[PDB]
Amino acid sequence: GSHMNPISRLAQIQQAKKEKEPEYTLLTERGLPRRREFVMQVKVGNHTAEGTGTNKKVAKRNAAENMLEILGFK
RNA sequence: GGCAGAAGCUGCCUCUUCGGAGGCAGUUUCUGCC
Numbered sequence: 544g545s546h547m548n549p550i551s552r553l554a555q556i557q558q559a560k561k562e563k564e565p566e567y568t569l570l571t572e573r574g575l576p577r578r579r580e581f582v583m584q585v586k587v588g589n590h591t592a593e594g595t596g597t598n599k600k601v602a603k604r605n606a607a608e609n610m611l612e613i614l615g616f617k
Numbered sequence: 618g619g620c621a622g623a624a625g626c627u628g629c630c631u632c633u634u635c636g637g638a639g640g641c642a643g644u645u646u647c648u649g650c651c
Binding site for chain 1: 622624625634636646647
């Protein structure tokens with residue numbers, strides 16, 4: 544089961560399996576004449592997730608909902 | 618003695634091609650390493 548959000552729990556699992564921490568990247572290759580958005584990509588060992596936001600502390604939190612379903616914590 | 622990771626609730630700033638973008642804190646909780 545769980546006792547935390549998909550974000551704090553994900554960060555906490557990496558420390559319990561004698562690993563370190565996740566790794567995160569900014570994409571934002573977008574450039575449409577009437578649409579823009581933040582776009583984030585994270586990696587946890589052999590798999591990745593994506594999310595969007597309005598700053599570097601708000602895109603990271605939206606991808607978290609997928610970060611368990613990508614490596615086997617669904 | 619020193620180092621590392623994340624968020625619940627609440628609050629703030631700057632830019633805007635008028636699509637929207639860029640950025641933070643306060644308060645409270647959990648975890649790892651030498």
